[PDB]
DNA sequence: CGGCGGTACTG
DNA sequence: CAGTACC
DNA sequence: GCCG
């Protein structure tokens, strides 16, 4: 953590080209940040700047003008409106599109968010939610949700087996939400039981809001929600499920503990070697055009083991912990 | 030049 | 489909 | 934004 001075400010340039849609430079810079952070010494020089990988010429320049005059000038000509654009898409269900489209139309805070603005019903959920889904809760929180669903799941087959994943899994001491996995060892009783859990954990007043549910589907793989512990000093939680088939269990559980850029990363990996990575397998073969994308689909690989996705790539296992990008 | 992960709901 | 979301 |  051995430059805050720079990428303290490189964030706010980040976020502010995150909020507007920017996308991929947005994602650039995040790389350059990243790798500032895991970078020891203060990067000194213009040369020592491009070396570092994540960081090329149009960074480097930044960095040596935050390193001499003390300051980034661009941080000074960000647009007025991102941080309300930020307000905006800190909105379950709103992304860039819709909190420009709202700026655009005039809105400037939630109080015209919420008198004027024309809401989703994801979107309404998320505005009714808006603080406690800026939250993170103590992991000790975390566990007791997990259990709630695994009692219920566990009630009406003891052979479910559900793990909470995400920043949890990571090891992390404070969690966005809870991600929980189930599947099941025979293969097969995992099928339509979204049906029931969900149900079930209706009936206990468990669940308080459906954010993505398709129960229309005897097909469902993810329920995204809301819910919230019994009793006082409770405040409300998102709650993702995912119901995977057990042949899938190792690629649905590398995915959904993540991080986010582990998996990017990882999936980049497996396609410079003509291979395909994803929350339901690996693959190998796989046949893609010039432009990336997959033509021919290839072969399923065997994998049991997370450890197995990581030996198939020739990679070296990392735990959990490890996977903290 | 042009890709930058791969997938699942919503309406 | 585009937008948003998941990790 | 970075990089092949
Ligand atoms: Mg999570
Ligand atoms: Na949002
Ligand atoms: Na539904």
Redesign the pocket.
Known sequence: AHNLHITEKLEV?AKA?SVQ?????????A??IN?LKSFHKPVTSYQEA?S???????????IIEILESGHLR?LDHISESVPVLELF?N???????????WYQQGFRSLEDIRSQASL????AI?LKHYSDFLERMPREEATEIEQTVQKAAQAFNSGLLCVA???Y??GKATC????VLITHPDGRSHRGIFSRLLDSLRQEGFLTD????????G??????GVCRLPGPGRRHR?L?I?VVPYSEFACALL??????????????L??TKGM??????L?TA?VRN?????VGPGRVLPTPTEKDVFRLLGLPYREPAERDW
């Open positions: 340039l080209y849609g920017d996308k991929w430079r947005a994602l650039g810079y790389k350059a790798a491009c570092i990988p994540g960081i090329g010429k149009r960074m480097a320049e930044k661009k898409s909105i379950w269900g709103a992304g860039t599109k819709t909190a420009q489209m989703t019903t994801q979107q998320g994943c995400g920043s899994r990571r966005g939400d809870v991600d459906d954010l993505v549910s398709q129960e229309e589907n097909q469902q793989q993810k329920y995204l998102r993702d995912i995915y959904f503990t993540g991080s986010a850029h582990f998996n990017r990363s990882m999936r980049a497996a396609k395909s990575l994803s929350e339901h397998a693959s796989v010039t432009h990336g994308c997959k």
